[PDB]
């Protein structure tokens, strides 16, 4: 071990450096704020077009259309206001674990156990939906994909790799290495300049899209991280794992800020999201229901129990009017 | 609402093709193909008519068989083994000639008792094949079974050694009342593997019709 020793002391130095900036805790400051009371939300729409477990769901930027991906090899573009179906795209593989709707609205993305990201074009002549591109180059199942614009995309796979592609060519343009486990989640910043990915290392990272180097690394969980989300402000992020605990971090102090746990919760987290103002935290569980936490006081205020099987996805509209939950019983529910 | 009555008409035409496709895809047999590597899966897929995962489709006696090979998937099994829930059967390919090479059989039984006692495959039947048996006789006549099983107090013959190996595999399941383990001794020249699979899946289909019909 010629140089396998100073890493430990450097880790200790960063540990007690971030411990130095611990004048107070968020709990002490938040003790003076009034609680939100009781949160009561009810189902408004139910979408019934899937014949298998739902693994992915995404909102569009108009907060009306949403894309859903199931394990029966079908992408469905709903219309949440009228529960109509606009497009039913059949895929060449029925093993799908992610989906995403482009911000412009002219494309969708999909992927799964085929190790290939399929990008589909919705706005074209001939009146059909065509596979615009197929992106290959990864060595594992695809966990998450997010659009930056209509020509760029970020991918996270089980081969301990996140990549930044371009659509016209087909090539990657940057590869993010460092995770020792496999990435199961990914979330871009609101300004879309740096994204957070959390793998099975019980840890999360911060990457730089422009450069391609891991700026910061966050730890504190004791099991694989399944879900991650960025706070609306852009200087914090929530997460969830299998130890039934969520925790809100912050990019400025570079350490965990709060924890959200209960002594009647023993399952894992499958999805995490915020609200428009960042006051509520929506977490999906394996107990066939979802929980709503106060993001400042870490106290439960309500539950969303309407699914026969465990919820796999969970999203919130851009305008914050409603939230959508998709579970393993092939039913999407919109709560408002 | 003149152009919104056509929207409703479209959503009913495409909801009529999801139902037809669902009914067409519910009449098919689905078989996962597991097994430690270097085992004989490449031979088994060659026996029948015949990248992340590789699916294989073939027909036999007015039946449709889909076989999912998930081996070029080096990753954590816990993150994608719940996708294959509901598969009709699991085909496990274990070779008999790896009793001395490195200990391999041991790992094979570890894999077997990992998948067999899983939380998602509690009532999924396991067809077990042993394609390697031609040179197994030569290897067992040249070297005894004490390499892998020091507790084997038996003769050095194929008939007893194969059965002794078989009991260890059939004694790793903790559900003796919900799932069955069908066994076969496949050889390179044997063409009855399709028939064995068809009979096992026919019994599985009979048992499934029986739960769904609502009876015992």
């Amino acid at each position, epitope marked *: 071990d010629q140089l396998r020793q100073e890493a430990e002391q450097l880790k200790n130095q960063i540990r007690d450096a971030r411990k130095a900036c611990a004048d107070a805790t968020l709990s002490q400051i938040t003790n003076n704020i009034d609680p939100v009371g009781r949160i009561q939300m009810r189902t408004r729409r139910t979408l019934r077009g899937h014949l298998a477990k739902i693994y992915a769901m995404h909102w569009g930027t108009d907060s009306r259309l949403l894309v859903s991906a199931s394990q029966d090899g079908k992408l469905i573009i709903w219309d949440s206001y009228t529960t109509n179906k606009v497009h039913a795209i059949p895929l060449r593989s029925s093993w799908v674990m992610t989906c995403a709707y482009a911000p412009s609205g002219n494309y969708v993305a999909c992927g799964g156990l085929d190790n290939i990201c399929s990008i589909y074009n919705l706005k074209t002549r001939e009146g059909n939906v065509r596979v615009s591109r197929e992106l290959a180059g990864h060595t594992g199942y695809l966990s998450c994909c997010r659009f930056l614009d209509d020509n760029q995309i970020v991918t996270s796979s089980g081969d301990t790799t996140c990549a930044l592609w371009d659509i016209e060519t087909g090539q990657q343009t940057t590869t993010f290495t460092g995770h020792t486990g496999d990435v199961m989640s990914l979330s871009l910043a609101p300004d879309t300049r740096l994204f957070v990915s959390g793998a099975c290392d019980a840890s999360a990272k911060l990457w730089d899209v422009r450069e391609g180097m891991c700026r910061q690394t966050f730890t504190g969980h004791e099991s694989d991280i399944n879900a991650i989300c960025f706070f609306p402000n852009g200087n914090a992020f929530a997460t969830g794992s299998d130890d039934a605990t969520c925790r809100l971090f912050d990019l400025r102090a570079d350490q965990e800020l709060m924890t959200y746990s209960h002594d009647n919760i023993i399952c894992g987290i499958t999805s995490v999201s915020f609200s428009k103002s960042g006051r509520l935290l929506l977490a999906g569980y394996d107990d066939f229901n979802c929980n709503v936490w106060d993001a400042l006081k870490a106290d439960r205020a309500g539950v969303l129990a309407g699914h026969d099987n465990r919820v796999s996805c969970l999203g919130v509209t851009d305008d914050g009017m409603a939230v959508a939950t998709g579970s393993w019983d092939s039913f999407l529910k919109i709560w408002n | 609402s003149a152009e919104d009555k056509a929207a409703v*008409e*479209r959503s009913k035409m495409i909801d009529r093709n999801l139902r037809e496709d669902g009914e067409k895809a519910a009449r098919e047999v689905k078989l996962l193909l597991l097994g430690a590597g270097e085992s004989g899966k490449s031979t088994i897929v060659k026996q029948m008519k015949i990248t992340g995962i590789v699916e294989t489709h073939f027909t036999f006696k007015d039946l449709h068989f889909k076989m999912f090979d998930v081996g070029g998937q080096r990753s954590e099994r816990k993150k994608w083994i719940h996708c294959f829930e509901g598969v009709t059967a699991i085909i496990f390919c274990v070779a008999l000639s790896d009793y001395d090479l490195v200990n391999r059989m041991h790992e094979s039984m570890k894999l077997f008792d990992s998948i067999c006692n899983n939380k998602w495959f509690t009532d999924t039947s396991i067809i077990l094949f042993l394609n390697k048996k031609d040179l197994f006789e030569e290897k067992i006549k040249k070297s005894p079974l004490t390499i892998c099983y020091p507790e084997y107090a038996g003769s050095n013959t194929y008939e007893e050694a194969a059965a002794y190996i078989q009991c260890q595999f059939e004694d790793l399941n903790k559900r003796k009342d919900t799932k069955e383990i069908y066994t076969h001794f496949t050889c390179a020249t044997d063409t009855k593997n399709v028939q064995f699979v068809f009979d096992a899946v026919t019994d599985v289909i009979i048992k499934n019709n029986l739960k769904d019909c609502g009876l015992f």
Partner: single-chain antibody
Amino acid sequence: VQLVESGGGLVQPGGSRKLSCSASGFAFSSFGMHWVRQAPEKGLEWVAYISSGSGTIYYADTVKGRFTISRDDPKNTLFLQMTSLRSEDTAMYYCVRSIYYYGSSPFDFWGQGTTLTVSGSADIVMTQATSSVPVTPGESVSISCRSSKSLLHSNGNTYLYWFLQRPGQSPQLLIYRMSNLASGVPDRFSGSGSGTAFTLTISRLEAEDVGVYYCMQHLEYPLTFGAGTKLEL
């Protein structure tokens, strides 16, 4: 995307005839289809509509009973069969495609037409007050259209369409729903309205926007066009 129609010619009055339109380049089975006729010296008039899957059929009075619309999806063909052909049924007939979902663009593509010669009150009346606006190149023009009933439905959408017919050619879609520009249209055209009066603005007029402009509604079953407005250099 191509739409070629055939049939018609010299037909004695009181006879029968059939027109056939063939499509090449788009999914014919996923598009509703319309037959629209135009008199030699008059505006466009909507004749018939057949929904995809052939589950919905509409016709217009002047032809109701004596005309039939059908489609052959495997052969990608549309048939119009007419009988008891009068002397008022001599016109040019165009085939139009239209697909309806959230955010679609109906009436996007028009055919070429087949010449043909045979020698109520609830419908909304669309009136274009002006009929000829001579404007020099490089000027801003405004064309006004009127409606008897408010086209603003109770969902946010108002159904009013602006087409353009250059001389010697078939109409083209410029604007749908009064505020959306069709694909392939320069950015110069604009549409405004308040539910009853609508305005089209051809800003920076160039050497192509010469022809007749028709304002169409799609709020209610029978579809009605305007009288037309001519633009001259």
